[PDB]
Structure 1
């Protein structure tokens, strides 16, 4: 994967951004989150993930709570 920290995530809207070292923030949607738990993330949370290119540009995939 790749590593970063959740910059913010709105659990009502179902999206937020992941902050990365030496890079632009990366959009994260709830559908990308891994695990049986409720599909939410919280400010400051450590994650591993993959950057993929969709029709709107870069986005996270395979987002795992560390």
Structure 2
């Protein structure tokens, strides 16, 4: 079950070293947790799993253990995310 699909949001922050971040939903203005494994289309020219602070992402919302979370996270229209400056380019 998916609570919401293709939600658009702005990354609040994402910690590359520790592997998680938060996205602010553009529709409800609620922060949602995003795990590194929830990123579906990583920047193919970085080599870590990440989204970058402030970038615009598109995602599904599902029920987590500590609140609703983001999953299937991509750029708008399913394109690769930009990724974090804390994740070096190849």
TM norm structure 1? 0.87
Give the secondary-structure state (helix, strand or coil) at the position aligned to 2:37.
helix
Task: Give the superposition deviation at 1:43.
Answer: 0.8
How many residues were matched structurally?
66
Q: Which has the higher strand share?
A: 1
Structure 1 stretches of at least 4 aligned residues deviating more than 3 Å after TM superposition? none
C-alpha separation in 1, matches of 2:10 and 2:29: 12
Q: Structure 2: give runs of 5+ residues left out of the alignment.
A: 1-5, 77-90
RMSD value over aligned CA atoms? 1.4
C-alpha separation in 2, matches of 1:7 and 1:60: 13
In terms of Rg, which structure is larger?
Answer: 2
Say if 2:19 and 2:50, in contact at 8 Å, map to a contact too.
Answer: yes
- 1:64 equivalent in structure 2: 74
TM norm structure 2? 0.66
C-alpha separation in 1, matches of 2:72 and 2:21: 15
